[model samples]
Target: MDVFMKGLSKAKEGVVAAAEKTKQGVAEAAGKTKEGVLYVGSKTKEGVVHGVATVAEKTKEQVTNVGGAVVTGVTAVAQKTVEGAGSIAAATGFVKKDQL
Candidate 1:
């Protein structure tokens, strides 16, 4: 009975030591996992910001192109109208040939 008690005591100590080691390992792993999550989150944020900036730049360029096209169209129409008016004026003898 004495030997059995001694063996039991040693077994209990071993089990406790194992449990402590496992607890330490689990805590370390949790810390590492948290760090990894933070790193991934940071990277994702950066990627999203970059994507938004790129989209904004593209949209701005498209808007600029459309504005330029509108301005060109307006200018062309104005010139044509002026030419047509000049023709009408010339027919009515309202403009000198040297002025044209």
Candidate 2:
């Protein structure tokens, strides 16, 4: 019997898990950008010139920090693949945390 095969099979789960979560977060940033940019921009200076231009402006613009998060997830992948998920969410860097 192939005893080592179970490890390879189970580790695959984390890859898709991280992929799924990353897409979810990236969408959130995209959605927030659409509604907020104009709703708060008002019109011009009141639209895009001033009004601090940093609410939706700070919300202003962001592409979602998923790159950093994905790395964390992947590291935890090689680091543990079977679980954990964080070179970021967990500075402790232990890949054994299977929490949701």
Candidate 3:
């Protein structure tokens, strides 16, 4: 500051005052760049979190769908069994349609 020749400027007082202006520009540019990057960084991270939630929703839907399928199969079999018994008088025979 007091005793210097800042290479580019090469003048003592010129280097001091010019260095101040240069530092100001650099600081402002750096701060602006940092602000933009942090905002973008947060947005990108939020999108990734939403993607994970989407996958979770699909997993839950698949699990419930499988459970529903099993229930349907069991219900179908049990209803047919009851229908078979209802159609018979003595009820210990191989029945098909309606033979009551």
Candidate 4:
């Protein structure tokens, strides 16, 4: 049964590799998300500053449009994350567990 055991071992290794890859992907996604948030915040701050300096020229419509666009983008990211988590959880049942 040595070959059978080796096959099992290979499958386990593959599963662990997939988990590692998913972990790295999640981390990278989180880092990118943080960067996105920071960028959005910076833009918002700039818009606010501009509005304060040129109050008459900046309308509520302009501010709202920018804010709404940022919100939409953030919401899409959040949705993608939720979907990713769901997929991972669903796939967990199919992976072989190590007894060691």
Candidate 5:
């Protein structure tokens, strides 16, 4: 009965050790899973921000180009009127060409 008791005690110890090892492994796996989820979430946010920034940049460029064209056309018309008035003024001796 003494020999049988020693064998049972050794078997219990082995079982406890294996259970402790499995618990540690499960805890480590849970930690790694959490970290992976956080990493993916951060990456997704980064991608979304990047896409928005790109769209904003393109929109600004388009607005600037269209606004520039409008300003250019308005300026050309004003310049032509100014030149015509200056020519008439010079003919009527109201002002010299150089002064205009």
Candidate 6:
């Protein structure tokens, strides 16, 4: 009976030790998982920044092209207006008009 009691005590200790080791392993694995998640989040942030930069670059190029087109259109219209004004002036034959 005494030997059986000693064996039972030893068995309990073994079980407790195994439980503690399992707990420690779970805690360590959780920490590693957290680190992995943070790393992925950081990479996602970097990807978003790169994506925004690419979009901004594309928008800037588009705006520059549109601006150039606007300038060309405005200049052509102004040239036509100037020619129309000269023709009106020639047709009026020294009329004292507002010349608007």
- Candidate 2 stretches with Cα past 4 Å from truth are 1-55, 58-60, 66-68, 72-100
C-alpha positional error of residue 99 in candidate 2 after TM-score superposition, expressed in Å: 55
Worst 10 residues of 5 by lDDT: 35-44
After aligning candidate 4 to the native by TM-score, how far in Å is the CA of 91 from where it should be? 1.8
User: What's model 4's lDDT at 16?
Assistant: 43
Task: Please give the clash total of every predicted structure, in order.
Answer: 0, 6, 0, 0, 0, 0
- lDDT tens digits, residue span 18-96, model 2: 2322332221212111211222111212222223232344454554322211322232211224256543222342234
Clashes of 6: 0
TM-scores vs. true structure, each candidate = 0.10, 0.10, 0.12, 0.16, 0.11, 0.10
On residues 1-100, what C-alpha lDDT tens digit does candidate 5 reach at each position? 1211111222333434323223322212122212112111111121221222213643434433322112233322112334343332222313224532
- Tell me how many residue pairs clash in candidate 4: 0
For each candidate, the alpha-carbon lDDT, in order, equals 0.26, 0.28, 0.29, 0.32, 0.26, 0.26
Instruction: Give the alpha carbon lDDT tens digit for every residue of 20-76 in model 4.
Output: 223322212121113122233422222332332324475555433434225444532
Model 5 misplaced regions, further than 4 Å: 1-55, 58-61, 65-70, 75-100
Predicted candidate 1 versus true structure: per-residue lDDT over 9-37, tens digit per residue = 22333444323223322212121211112
Summarize candidate 6's per-residue lDDT along 19-84 as a digit string, tens digits. Answer: 322332221212121111211111111122122221364343443232211222232211233434
Best-matching candidate per TM-score? 4
Better structure of 1 and 3 per TM-score:
3
User: Candidate 2, overall lDDT?
Assistant: 0.28
Q: Report the C-alpha lDDT of model 3 over 1-100, residue by residue, as the tens digit.
A: 1332233333545434322224422212122212112111111121221222213543434432322112233322112244354443342323336544
- Point to the candidate with the largest lDDT: 4
Residue pairs with clashing backbones, model 4: none
